[PDB]
Amino acid sequence: MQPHLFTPLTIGSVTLRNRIGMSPMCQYSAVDGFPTDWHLMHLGARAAGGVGLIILEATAVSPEGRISPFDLGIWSDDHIAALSRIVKLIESLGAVAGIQLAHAGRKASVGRPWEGGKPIAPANGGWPVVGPTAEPFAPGYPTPIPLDAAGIARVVADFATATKRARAAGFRWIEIHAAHGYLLHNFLSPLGNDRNDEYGGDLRGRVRLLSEVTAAVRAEWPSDLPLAVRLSCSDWTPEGLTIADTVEVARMLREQGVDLIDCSSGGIAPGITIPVGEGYQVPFAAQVRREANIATAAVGLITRPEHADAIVRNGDADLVLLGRELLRDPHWPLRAARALGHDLAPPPQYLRAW
Amino acid sequence: MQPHLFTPLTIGSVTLRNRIGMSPMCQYSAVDGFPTDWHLMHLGARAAGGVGLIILEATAVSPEGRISPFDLGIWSDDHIAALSRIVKLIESLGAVAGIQLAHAGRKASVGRPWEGGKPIAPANGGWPVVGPTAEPFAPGYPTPIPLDAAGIARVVADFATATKRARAAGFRWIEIHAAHGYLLHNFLSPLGNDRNDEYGGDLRGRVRLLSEVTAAVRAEWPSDLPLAVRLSCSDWTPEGLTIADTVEVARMLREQGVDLIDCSSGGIAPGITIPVGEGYQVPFAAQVRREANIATAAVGLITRPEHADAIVRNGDADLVLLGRELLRDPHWPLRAARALGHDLAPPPQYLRAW
Ligand SMILES: Cc1cc2nc3c(=O)[nH]c(=O)nc-3n(C[C@H](O)[C@H](O)[C@H](O)COP(=O)(O)O)c2cc1C
Ligand SMILES: Cc1cc2nc3c(=O)[nH]c(=O)nc-3n(C[C@H](O)[C@H](O)[C@H](O)COP(=O)(O)O)c2cc1C
Numbered sequence A, B: 001m002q003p004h005l006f007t008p009l010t011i012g013s014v015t016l017r018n019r020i021g022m023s024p025m026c027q028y029s030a031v032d033g034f035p036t037d038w039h040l041m042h043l044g045a046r047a048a049g050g051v052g053l054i055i056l057e058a059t060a061v062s063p064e065g066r067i068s069p070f071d072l073g074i075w076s077d078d079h080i081a082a083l084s085r086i087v088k089l090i091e092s093l094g095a096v097a098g099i100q101l102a103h104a105g106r107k108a109s110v111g112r113p114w115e116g117g118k119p120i121a122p123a124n125g126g127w128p129v130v131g132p133t134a135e136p137f138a139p140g141y142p143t144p145i146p147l148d149a150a151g152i153a154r155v156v157a158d159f160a161t162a163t164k165r166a167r168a169a170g171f172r173w174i175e176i177h178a179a180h181g182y183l184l185h186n187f188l189s190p191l192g193n194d195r196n197d198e199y200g201g202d203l204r205g206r207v208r209l210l211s212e213v214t215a216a217v218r219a220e221w222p223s224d225l226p227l228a229v230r231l232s233c234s235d236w237t238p239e240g241l242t243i244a245d246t247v248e249v250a251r252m253l254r255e256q257g258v259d260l261i262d263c264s265s266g267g268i269a270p271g272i273t274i275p276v277g278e279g280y281q282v283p284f285a286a287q288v289r290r291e292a293n294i295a296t297a298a299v300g301l302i303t304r305p306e307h308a309d310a311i312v313r314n315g316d317a318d319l320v321l322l323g324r325e326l327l328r329d330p331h332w333p334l335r336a337a338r339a340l341g342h343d344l345a346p347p348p349q350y351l352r353a354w
Helices: A037-049 A079-092 A149-168 A183-188 A208-220 A243-255 A282-291 A305-313 A324-328 A332-340 A348-353 B037-048 B079-092 B149-169 B183-188 B208-220 B243-255 B282-291 B305-313 B324-328 B332-340 B348-353
Strands: A009-011 A014-016 A020-022 A053-060 A096-102 A173-178 A227-232 A260-264 A295-299 A319-322 B009-011 B014-016 B020-022 B053-060 B096-102 B173-178 B227-232 B260-264 B295-299 B319-322
Touching: A014 A096, A020 A332, A037 A053, A037 A079, A037 A332, A037 B037, A037 B079, A053 A079, A053 A173, A079 A096, A079 A149, A079 B037, A096 A149, A149 A173, A149 A208, A173 A183, A173 A208, A183 A208, A183 A227, A208 A227, A208 A243, A227 A243, A243 A260, A243 A282, A260 A282, A260 A319, A282 A295, A305 A319, A305 A332, A319 A324, A324 B348, A348 B324, B020 B332, B037 B053, B037 B079, B053 B079, B053 B173, B079 B096, B079 B149, B096 B149, B149 B173, B149 B208, B173 B183, B173 B208, B183 B208, B183 B227, B208 B227, B208 B243, B227 B243, B243 B260, B243 B282, B260 B282, B260 B319, B282 B295, B305 B319, B305 B332, B319 B324
Parallel strands: A020 A053, A020 A319, A053 A096, A096 A173, A173 A227, A227 A260, A260 A295, A295 A319, B020 B053, B020 B319, B053 B096, B096 B173, B173 B227, B227 B260, B260 B295, B295 B319
Antiparallel strands: A009 A014, B009 B014
């Protein structure tokens, strides 16, 4: 009589068949924000693998908000068609389709990870980036234009429009990317802010932008459908965001009608030694969930089925997200099920294999 | 000097990157012979997973030749567009796109395996079947209208047009399905085929259909592209086909220009006890390679990386085809490379996971 890895989960009118999600993972394979056949196959395989929730990569609410020129985008109505096609593949295979709205902020305009991931200058078809202050992310990175009032309203509107498009594309779950040194986290974290205005200083100020985005997003997204935020729970130095801070943000987000905190960390700056290891971020998921009375997703080097189960049974999170493990093994849910002794049918096309 | 599982294979203008092929596997997921997003993801995924050669399922050269109403088709020019799209995805991931042309013949007009695979009547969307004699396959199956002068050269033409179509879609490997109880095998096997024409009785006779089909295909198939034929090598019964016969058939197909025999078995009639087990068809692949001096593929309950490798190292076969292993694990070649100590990188999108 406790929740396990293969217990459904209901928020609003959306029921995940189990507690396994595919974590948002950029593919750097879009053209002008448009997906290719790559995306259909990549996301499809996991939905056929048996995960209950596919969350699409960081999808840029605007061109300047992309990590790379190859980022999936949602800044035009033209983006709706190919995304809904992806939604239909995913849902025919019994998973729920979700999407991560993103803005890379001062970390935008870089090359693909597998090409060294170096900043691309505006001469080579980069673009000027934005942020809370003109403080570059690292040596060699561009000097961001600090957002003023007009730039801030633009972002909120951009998230708001993106939300409409996601709805039209048939997504039944949306996550706001407010982690990994990107625009929202950059505002939230003391390490990147020097802003003395209402969008910095105190925690109440530093959270203002995430809060305006959340409200704009939430207002466009039917109360009926799950909304998530992904946070960088800790900056992993004493002078940055701590879990305590995160808890207070989660509490405020809950009040704004967010259904789930997806609990990540890192990214605000380079050179921060982060204690990586199996389930190293689960404790953040545990704390947020207890203390902010909100559902959480746990993530980071979760690869073993019994570990995933323990996370759900121990009430440390509601959702277990797999990144790399699902890249290695899109059929992991099916193996998880047999390892734990739960019932999961493969695609009918594959019955004669199992 | 001599090869292992990850050694390239050249035939004409086509270089397979390793010795691992995906065995043709019917998906029962087409409408009027057209594929869906199911196929693109299903086939793309195994190419993403690093197999050298993707053989598409049994693709019907005519409507009547389909196993099920839901079979892939290549009887119409309409079918070119969608299949080339499948080919471009496959080729973009570094694998070679192949296709198996098929005619279910007497076993034609049945439902999906997971829907009881029971015959479907003409009143109910079924179609009258065709083949060597008027004898049904088993209790319950329709009555095959025997093929005449006319019927025969329609089948031969069909295989030939299909072949033109496959070239147009960009397939660079073609296999003729002359196994599993289907039209060509049905004519080749004494069991259940009592024909007494020049298309029956003697081996010289029983093989005529396959040889003409072979000739037709070869003529349309450019000479720099490999051609394979899958055979049932044994009927597993005393009075049926034997490795001795298959060896003779192979020797004949080598002289017709066929580049490889894909060595399967079974399917002529029900009630034949088949001694299934790991590598149970591999001695057939060995013997055909030994005595007919022709390249071969092995297939049948091969799952282990070292066994697949041992098959190639020993010269039992040139190519190892995996069916069910790849349904279960599209990424098998990546795991098999790691276990045997060969370099095989995953798609760049996935490098962070390996
Ligand atoms: C290729 C790749 C792409 C990623 N893309 C995103 C992304 O678009 N958005 C995001 O919030 N996190 C992204 N991440 C981080 C993961 O979503 C996830 O939080 C973390 O890697 C979980 O660890 P795991 O990969 O060990 O499961 C990505 C990670 C990888 C390896
Ligand atoms: C779902 C499924 C569909 C298949 N469809 C075909 C087919 O279209 N053509 C064919 O020649 N063999 C077909 N086969 C047989 C396999 O290609 C293969 O030769 C045999 O299963 C080899 O053993 P393996 O699956 O253990 O590798 C199919 C097998 C399965 C399980």
